[PDB]
Amino acid sequence: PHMATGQDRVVALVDMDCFFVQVEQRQNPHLRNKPCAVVQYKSWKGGGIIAVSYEARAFGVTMSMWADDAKKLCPDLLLAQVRESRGKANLTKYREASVEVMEIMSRFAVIERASIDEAYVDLTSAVQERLQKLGQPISADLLPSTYIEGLPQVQKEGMRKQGLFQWLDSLQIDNLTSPDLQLTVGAVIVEEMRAAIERETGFQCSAGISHNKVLAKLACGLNKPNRQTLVSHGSVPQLFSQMPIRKIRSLGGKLGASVIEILGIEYMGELTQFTESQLQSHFGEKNGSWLYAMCRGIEHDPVKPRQLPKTIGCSKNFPGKTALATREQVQWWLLQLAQELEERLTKDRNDNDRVATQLVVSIRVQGDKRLSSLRRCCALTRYDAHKMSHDAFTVIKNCNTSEWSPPLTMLFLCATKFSAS
DNA sequence: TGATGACGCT
DNA sequence: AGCGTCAT
Numbered sequence: 001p002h003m004a005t006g007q008d009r010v011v012a013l014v015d016m017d018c019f020f021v022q023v024e025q026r027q028n029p030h031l032r033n034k035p036c037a038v039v040q041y042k043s044w045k046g047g048g049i050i051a052v053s054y055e056a057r058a059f060g061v062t063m064s065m066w067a068d069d070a071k072k073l074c075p076d077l078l079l080a081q082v083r084e085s086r087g088k089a090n091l092t093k094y095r096e097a098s099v100e101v102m103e104i105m106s107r108f109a110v111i112e113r114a115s116i117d118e119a120y121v122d123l124t125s126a127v128q129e130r131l132q133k134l135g136q137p138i139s140a141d142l143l144p145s146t147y148i149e150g151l152p153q154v155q156k157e158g159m160r161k162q163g164l165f166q167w168l169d170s171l172q173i174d175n176l177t178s179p180d181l182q183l184t185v186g187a188v189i190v191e192e193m194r195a196a197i198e199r200e201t202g203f204q205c206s207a208g209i210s211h212n213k214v215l216a217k218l219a220c221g222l223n224k225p226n227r228q229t230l231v232s233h234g235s236v237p238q239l240f241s242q243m244p245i246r247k248i249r250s251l252g253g254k255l256g257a258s259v260i261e262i263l264g265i266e267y268m269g270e271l272t273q274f275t276e277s278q279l280q281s282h283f284g285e286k287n288g289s290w291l292y293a294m295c296r297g298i299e300h301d302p303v304k305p306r307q308l309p310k311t312i313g314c315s316k317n318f319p320g321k322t323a324l325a326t327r328e329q330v331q332w333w334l335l336q337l338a339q340e341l342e343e344r345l346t347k348d349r350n351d352n353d354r355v356a357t358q359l360v361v362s363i364r365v366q367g368d369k370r371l372s373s374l375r376r377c378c379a380l381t382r383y384d385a386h387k388m389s390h391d392a393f394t395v396i397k398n399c400n401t402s403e404w405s406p407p408l409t410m411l412f413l414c415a416t417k418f419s420a421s
Numbered sequence: 422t423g424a425t426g427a428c429g430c431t
Numbered sequence: 432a433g434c435g436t437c438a439t
């Protein structure tokens with residue numbers, strides 16, 4: 001009676017399907033329902049693919065594939081190019097499409113912007129309200145695109161409905177504090193949210209509904225595209241019993257590899273065999289407690305009330321022979337970046353009633369193994385591109401070993417530390 | 422041959 | 432503060 005079960009909140013994660021592709025398909029109907037991809041920089045191997053329609057994925061086309069290589073798998077692949085301004089990729093169209101979706105989501109609940117195409121939603125309050133509206137049963141008709149993970153327990157839609165039926169058939173609708181009922185009502189609301197997003201933007205999305213952010217995110221990916229998935233507390237032991245550790249958000253990197261290496265396990269469920277102290281011993285007090293709870297389906301990270309980015313940045317690589325070797329080059333490109341940055345900052349100030357107060361300048365030198373050879377901050381007191389680019393140079397001036405030596409393979413300008421205005 | 426953006430550590 | 436990790 002004193003063991004927490006992490007069933008206190010209803011949390012959703014809404015993620016747009018093949019997002020940059022949908023933005024380009026809305027604009028150009030010729031791309032709709034076709035194997036297509038979004039690329040940046042046409043000149044090297046046809047350009048780098050950064051988003052892929054589900055039709056193209058069926059041919060094996062992936063992110064981070066050169067377009068020329070993708071065409072070997074999928075000869076009729078259609079392409080849309082990222083806009084280029086001031087000599088660099090410009091992502092404005094996708095950021096603006098993002099604002100369309102985020103503003104719609106914000107009508108339903110306060111959201112946390114987690115990326116350009118996804119947000120978490122805390123629906124706990126909304127669910128309580130809808131529950132008061134309700135002791136009536138919940139019809140399957142209200143969950144037309146919802147999967148219940150773990151159920152049923154020979155066509156795709158047939159399986160979905162059978163699982164949904166088993167779920168609804170055993171719900172206790174007379175209990176307003178039932179976690180399973182709360183999740184179900186959550187899923188009804190997310191059906192409504194996803195309907196509004198598609199009606200008002202044209203964009204389809206997937207979603208996960210569970211009791212916390214990590215499970216919601218995991219759920220979202222289980223049935224994509226254009227579907228949503230409910231992961232109940234009860235579904236966790238079976239789900240985690242064969243779930244590779246790397247699939248869980250934040251464990252896809254070196255920490256996750258060390259969990260696998262040090263403990264000699266493969267699946268998230270196997271973590272339950274360790275005491276909290278054992279896990280803290282290996283991975284630190286914070287990670288240890290987090291893992292101990294998370295492998296039990298429990299996580300407390302709040303949905304933060306933030307739908308605007310906290311930083312506004314401009315970045316460009318200069319690979320191989322294109323590395324910047326003269327001061328005229330370095331200053332010209334700092335200026336190009338500063339000009340895009342000023343543009344976005346001025347728009348931000350008018351839209352969002354805030355001003356950035358710190359400019360961060362980051363570079364990479366040719367032979368450096370680190371992604372950043374220098375990261376330095378200075379004051380950002382005026383939205384002026386020439387001043388920002390001049391300040392950036394001043395701050396990286398002493399890096400030159402010299403004519404710029406070694407040549408620079410990356411420049412980065414980032415506006416940070418916003419204050420109300 | 423990429424362009425971002427959040428958060429943790431000392 | 433500057434660096435790193437993780438991700439999208």
Ligand SMILES: Nc1ccn([C@H]2C[C@H](O)[C@@H](COP(=O)(O)OP(=O)(O)OP(=O)(O)O)O2)c(=O)n1
Nearest residue numbers: 015016017018019020021050051052116117439
């Ligand atoms: N390494 C990456 C990953 C993504 N994106 C951009 C392109 C994507 O369209 C968008 C959202 O990324 P997702 O990882 O959510 O992938 P998609 O939305 O493209 O596909 P899915 O339907 O699998 O979510 O962000 C990017 O520029 N670089």
Ligand SMILES: [Ca+2]
Nearest residue numbers: 015016017018
């Ligand atoms: Ca997506």
Ligand SMILES: [Ca+2]
Nearest residue numbers: 015115117118
């Ligand atoms: Ca995403």
